[PDB]
Every structure is written in structure tokens, then in C-alpha cells.
Scaffold this active site. Sequence first.
Site, PDB file in Angstrom:
ATOM      1  N   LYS A  51       0.817  -1.211   0.000  1.00  0.00           N
ATOM      2  CA  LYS A  51       0.000   0.000   0.000  1.00  0.00           C
ATOM      3  C   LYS A  51       0.851   1.262   0.000  1.00  0.00           C
ATOM      4  O   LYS A  51       0.453   2.281  -0.575  1.00  0.00           O
ATOM      5  CB  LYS A  51      -0.931  -0.006   1.216  1.00  0.00           C
ATOM      6  N   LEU A  53       3.416   1.858  -1.652  1.00  0.00           N
ATOM      7  CA  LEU A  53       3.859   2.194  -2.993  1.00  0.00           C
ATOM      8  C   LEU A  53       2.804   3.043  -3.703  1.00  0.00           C
ATOM      9  O   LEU A  53       1.601   2.862  -3.491  1.00  0.00           O
ATOM     10  CB  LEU A  53       4.131   0.929  -3.797  1.00  0.00           C
ATOM     11  N   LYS A  63      -6.154  -7.572  -2.175  1.00  0.00           N
ATOM     12  CA  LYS A  63      -6.000  -8.684  -3.106  1.00  0.00           C
ATOM     13  C   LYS A  63      -4.604  -9.290  -3.036  1.00  0.00           C
ATOM     14  O   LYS A  63      -4.443 -10.505  -3.199  1.00  0.00           O
ATOM     15  CB  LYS A  63      -6.290  -8.223  -4.533  1.00  0.00           C
ATOM     16  N   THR A  92      -9.502 -11.025 -28.109  1.00  0.00           N
ATOM     17  CA  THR A  92      -8.833  -9.736 -28.241  1.00  0.00           C
ATOM     18  C   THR A  92      -7.364  -9.891 -28.607  1.00  0.00           C
ATOM     19  O   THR A  92      -6.784  -8.974 -29.204  1.00  0.00           O
ATOM     20  CB  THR A  92      -8.967  -8.937 -26.943  1.00  0.00           C
ATOM     21  N   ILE A  97      -9.281  -7.286 -33.265  1.00  0.00           N
ATOM     22  CA  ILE A  97     -10.403  -7.600 -32.392  1.00  0.00           C
ATOM     23  C   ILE A  97     -10.162  -6.906 -31.061  1.00  0.00           C
ATOM     24  O   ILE A  97      -9.150  -7.155 -30.394  1.00  0.00           O
ATOM     25  CB  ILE A  97     -10.566  -9.115 -32.202  1.00  0.00           C
ATOM     26  N   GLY A 180       8.478  -6.635 -29.027  1.00  0.00           N
ATOM     27  CA  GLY A 180       7.193  -7.119 -29.491  1.00  0.00           C
ATOM     28  C   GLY A 180       6.924  -6.819 -30.951  1.00  0.00           C
ATOM     29  O   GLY A 180       6.604  -7.724 -31.727  1.00  0.00           O
ATOM     30  N   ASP A 246       5.500  -1.192 -37.418  1.00  0.00           N
ATOM     31  CA  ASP A 246       4.857   0.105 -37.549  1.00  0.00           C
ATOM     32  C   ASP A 246       5.843   1.069 -38.192  1.00  0.00           C
ATOM     33  O   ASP A 246       6.998   1.160 -37.763  1.00  0.00           O
ATOM     34  CB  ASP A 246       4.400   0.634 -36.191  1.00  0.00           C
TER      35      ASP A 246
HETATM   36  N1  LIG Z   1      -0.918   5.870 -25.597  1.00  0.00           N
HETATM   37  C1  LIG Z   1       0.284   5.423 -26.282  1.00  0.00           C
HETATM   38  N2  LIG Z   1      -0.136   4.642 -27.253  1.00  0.00           N
HETATM   39  C2  LIG Z   1       0.779   4.054 -28.092  1.00  0.00           C
HETATM   40  N3  LIG Z   1       2.144   4.271 -27.932  1.00  0.00           N
HETATM   41  C3  LIG Z   1       2.569   5.056 -26.952  1.00  0.00           C
HETATM   42  C4  LIG Z   1       1.665   5.649 -26.108  1.00  0.00           C
HETATM   43  N4  LIG Z   1       2.355   6.383 -25.218  1.00  0.00           N
HETATM   44  C5  LIG Z   1       3.664   6.258 -25.510  1.00  0.00           C
HETATM   45  N5  LIG Z   1       3.798   5.424 -26.581  1.00  0.00           N
HETATM   46  C6  LIG Z   1       5.194   5.194 -26.993  1.00  0.00           C
HETATM   47  C7  LIG Z   1       5.758   4.262 -26.233  1.00  0.00           C
HETATM   48  C8  LIG Z   1       6.116   3.094 -27.142  1.00  0.00           C
HETATM   49  O1  LIG Z   1       7.377   2.694 -26.915  1.00  0.00           O
HETATM   50  C9  LIG Z   1       5.969   3.659 -28.624  1.00  0.00           C
HETATM   51  C10 LIG Z   1       5.348   2.503 -29.576  1.00  0.00           C
HETATM   52  O2  LIG Z   1       5.941   1.293 -29.240  1.00  0.00           O
HETATM   53  P1  LIG Z   1       4.998   0.024 -28.835  1.00  0.00           P
HETATM   54  O3  LIG Z   1       4.915  -0.895 -30.009  1.00  0.00           O
HETATM   55  O4  LIG Z   1       3.651   0.461 -28.447  1.00  0.00           O
HETATM   56  N6  LIG Z   1       5.691  -0.810 -27.498  1.00  0.00           N
HETATM   57  P2  LIG Z   1       7.350  -0.745 -27.259  1.00  0.00           P
HETATM   58  O5  LIG Z   1       7.997  -0.447 -28.564  1.00  0.00           O
HETATM   59  O6  LIG Z   1       7.676   0.305 -26.272  1.00  0.00           O
HETATM   60  O7  LIG Z   1       7.843  -2.215 -26.706  1.00  0.00           O
HETATM   61  P3  LIG Z   1       7.481  -3.568 -27.493  1.00  0.00           P
HETATM   62  O8  LIG Z   1       7.165  -3.179 -28.989  1.00  0.00           O
HETATM   63  O9  LIG Z   1       8.647  -4.511 -27.433  1.00  0.00           O
HETATM   64  O10 LIG Z   1       6.273  -4.223 -26.894  1.00  0.00           O
HETATM   65  O11 LIG Z   1       5.172   4.647 -28.546  1.00  0.00           O
HETATM   66 MN   LIG Z   2       4.229  -0.398 -32.370  1.00  0.00          MN
HETATM   67 NA    NA Z   3      -0.020   4.219  -2.048  1.00  0.00          NA
HETATM   68 NA    NA Z   4      -4.744  -7.375 -29.461  1.00  0.00          NA
END
Ligand SMILES: Nc1ncnc2c1ncn2[C@H]1C[C@H](O)[C@@H](COP(=O)(O)NP(=O)(O)OP(=O)(O)O)O1
Ligand SMILES: [Mn+2]
Ligand code: NA
Ligand code: NA
Length: 325
Positions: A51, A53, A63, A92, A97, A180, A246
Site C-alpha cells: 500500500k 507504494l 488482493k 482480443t 479484435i 514485441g 509500424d
Molecule cells: N498511448 C500510447 N499509445 C501508443 N504508444 C505510446 C503511447 N504512449 C507512448 N507510446 C510510446 C511508447 C512506445 O514505446 C511507442 C510505440 O511502441 P509500442 O509498439 O507500443 N511498445 P514498445 O515499442 O515500447 O515495446 P514492445 O514493442 O517490445 O512491446 O510509442
Molecule cells: Mn508499435
Molecule cells: Na499508495
Molecule cells: Na490485441
Amino acid sequence: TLNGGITDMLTELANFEKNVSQAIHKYNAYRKAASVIAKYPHKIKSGAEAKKLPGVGTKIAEKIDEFLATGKLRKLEKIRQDDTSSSINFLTRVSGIGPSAARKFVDEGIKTLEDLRKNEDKLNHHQRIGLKYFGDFEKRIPREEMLQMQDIVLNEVKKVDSEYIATVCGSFRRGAESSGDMDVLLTHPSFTSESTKQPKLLHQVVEQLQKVHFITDTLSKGETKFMGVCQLPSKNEKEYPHRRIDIRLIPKDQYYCGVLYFTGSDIFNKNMRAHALEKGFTINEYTIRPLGVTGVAGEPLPVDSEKDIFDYIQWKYREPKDRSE
DNA sequence: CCCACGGCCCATCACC
DNA sequence: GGTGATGGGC
DNA sequence: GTGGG
Ligand SMILES: Nc1ncnc2c1ncn2[C@H]1C[C@H](O)[C@@H](COP(=O)(O)NP(=O)(O)OP(=O)(O)O)O1
Ligand SMILES: [Mn+2]
Ligand code: NA
Ligand code: NA
Ligand SMILES: [Mn+2]
């Protein structure tokens, strides 16, 4: 990795709220809990301990106790048994989806991957691909492979125009040894904030990557934002897994604001935007603008490097790898 | 003791 | 055909 | 579900 059992348990609860109850706030809270709960340098061994934190409160602490005391949590378990809630969550995981498409598919009797194929008629394009690559999409990408991907992309971009700009952002730029998707950011000097619009400037470079059979299929594609699928080439052999890529095209002058955004943790991008608001600015993926004591956004500030933003609002310069929030 | 609580691009659907 | 809203993703 | 207010 310290309090791992908890982070998992909470991440599940978050997915449940997002996917099933469409309660994004309760989702984000479980994530901020679970996110900033591993930022903690101490094994949690009490909900009451937890808590203390930030973002961890009465309910989660309640929980956490049950998990520490019994090794499980009734609530989550009850959800896993609900044949419906489980069917909504699972779907999802297909790309395209969401909570709405998923609850609507389980109602009409579509509960599994097996039903989706049978009902491919109902599915739109994006979802037709997320199905095709459902497996390969739930795999992570290692940098060794990522490094290969980065070489091709840059090769084929320059080959179109020598003046292009292209930087791999996201997990990769933060040192992430596993990733990812591949997040890419493209600019051109002939594309700035004050120019009318892009004359096939993103399409031009995508075509090439499709021409060299790197980009295989396409989820979405516009004048600024391309979502699609890519694959590495094998010698001899076993095929590589298909991956998400992307590609985003931004104007050159706004480049250093998008690189920062599309690199640093979604939480980081939220951690810093808060400070910027307390500190008198409002940043976004394109600009960093000032706010009058009333709250009126001023005209875009000048930006020439990522570090610039991190002086405006002050804050300690966290270099990309240190930005894993 | 309540209640904000994140924003942008693309694709699709409902309506006209 | 052109709207404006919504869903989805990041 | 949480913490600011
Ligand atoms: N509301 C938001 N929505 C989408 N991207 C966001 C955001 N806020 C910040 N970003 C930033 C943060 C993200 O880094 C970037 C898009 O990268 P991702 O594919 O969404 N995920 P990442 O590359 O970080 O790690 P991995 O691909 O291995 O899962 O946009
Ligand atoms: Mn992305
Ligand atoms: Na707290
Ligand atoms: Na998804
Ligand atoms: Mn990414």
C-alpha cells in the site's frame, strides 16, 4: 522480476477490465500498480507493505494479501472459469479484435480460433491478418534478429531517396534485447510542418519493402501511419516468424519530438508529460508548446535535439535505455 | 469523501 | 456518393 | 482501483 507473481496477477486483472468490463481506468490502475510496482527495489510481502507504494491502494493490498496468504486470488479464478469472460479475453489477442468485436463474436457463438476461420466472412481485413499470424504475433523478437531487420529497412529506404531519414524507435532503441513489434520513424527534408501534404512519400518507401518481399501484408496504411507485417529471409530451411512493423512518417522539424515519444515507455511518455504540465508546457508526439497561466497553448517551441525537451520541463536527462518505465 | 482518469491515425459502419 | 462517430491499435 | 483535491 522481484515481485513477479504479483505483477502477473495484476496484469491479468488489468487485461480483464480492458477486455471484458471495458473499464480502462481500472485497467490503467492495475498497470500503473503493476508497472510502478516492479520499479520498487523491495520484495513485497504484505499488502499493507505494498500500500505504501504509489498507485497501490486498499483493494489491491487486500488482493495482494490473498495471493501471499493462499497463493491464488478468488476473483481472477472466477473470471477464468466464466466460459464467456475467458472467450472474450482470448479473442482480443487477435489483432483487430477489441473488447467490442470480441463480446459481439462470442454472443453470436464465435468462441475460438476455430470459429473465426469458419466465420472468416464476418471478419474485416485487419482481423483476417491477425488471425493468419496469430501465433507468430505472440512471439517476441530478439535484438539479434531485430538488428537484421534494421539493416534491410535502412538499405531499402535510402535506395529510394538519399535524403530520407529513418530511425528504429520503441523497445529496440531502449536496449531492449526482446521486442514485441518493430516501431519505425521516417522523415524527409521535403516534408516539414508548413508543407501542404505528402505526395506518396510514405507509399513510395513501403512499396520498395514490399518489392524486396520484406513487408508481406498490410494491416492499415495512410498518408502518415503504416501498420503491417514483415519477415526475415532464411538461407538453405525453416522460415522466420512473421513480425509486426509500424512505420510512421513525421515532418523533419517535429522529428525530435516523435522520436522521443515513439521510443520512451508508454508510462515514461506519461511520466514526462505530467512534469511538463506541472512545469508549464503541453507536449505531444509532434510538438512541445507553452501554456499561459490561463492554460492557452502557445505556438510550437523550437526543438533541435531530444535533449531540448528535457531542459524545458527540466527533469534528469534519462537516456533511452534508462527510460524503461 | 468523492471523482477525473490519455491522445492520435486508420478503417469501418450507420446514416443520409 | 459523402458525413461524422466509433472501434482498434499503438 | 487510486490518489489528488
Ligand atoms: N498511448 C500510447 N499509445 C501508443 N504508444 C505510446 C503511447 N504512449 C507512448 N507510446 C510510446 C511508447 C512506445 O514505446 C511507442 C510505440 O511502441 P509500442 O509498439 O507500443 N511498445 P514498445 O515499442 O515500447 O515495446 P514492445 O514493442 O517490445 O512491446 O510509442
Ligand atoms: Mn508499435
Ligand atoms: Na499508495
Ligand atoms: Na490485441
Ligand atoms: Mn514496439
